[PDB]
Specification:
The chain is an alpha+beta fold and 149 residues long. 35% of the residues lie in helices and 32% in strands. Helix 1 packs parallel to helix 2 (45-63) and helix 2 (45-63) packs antiparallel against helix 4 (115-125). The protein is globular and about 35 Å long.
Length: 149
């Protein structure tokens, strides 16, 4: 695991830069907002990164050309929350939970949403929570981790 202290907002930036070319090519309107530029946490930097990478990849794929992605990060005292919202069709409430389970079907297209590993990292490793809600003309994926283990 190796837990290090880092600016969580630095991870968000690295992941935007990773997908920036694609986001631009697709004419996706991207927004990042934080209520605290220095959002310090002790966590497994590599694994949290992996979660953000998956959430942004999925948001790009779900929103499609001319879509919209917003990431927000929030300082909540002893914990942080990161929200990755995309414009696009809602996830049916029935797959809202199911989506984080180790469930698998050949019906799923592409290489998968990778959300079981996301839940493994956030909840099982970090003691936090990850969930999804339907919002605006879109869908949001939210996680919360404690600031310290």
């Amino acid at each position: 695991m190796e837990f290090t202290e880092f600016n969580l907002n630095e991870l968000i930036r690295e992941v935007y830069v990773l997908f920036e070319e694609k986001i631009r090519k697709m004419n996706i309107d991207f927004c990042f907002e934080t209520d605290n530029e220095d959002l310090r946490v002790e966590a497994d930097r590599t694994r949290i990164k992996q979660v953000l990478i998956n959430l942004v990849q999925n948001a790009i794929e779900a929103t499609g050309e001319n879509g919209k992605i917003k990431i927000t990060s929030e300082d909540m005292y002893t914990k942080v929350r990161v929200s990755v919202w995309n414009s696009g069709p809602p996830i049916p409430e029935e797959l809202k939970e199911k989506i984080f389970s180790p469930f698998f079907t050949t019906k799923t297209q592409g290489t998968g949403l990778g959300l079981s590993i996301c839940r493994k990292i956030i909840e099982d490793e970090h003691g936090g929570k990850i969930w999804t809600e339907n919002r605006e003309n879109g869908v949001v994926f939210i996680f919360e981790i404690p600031k310290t283990p």
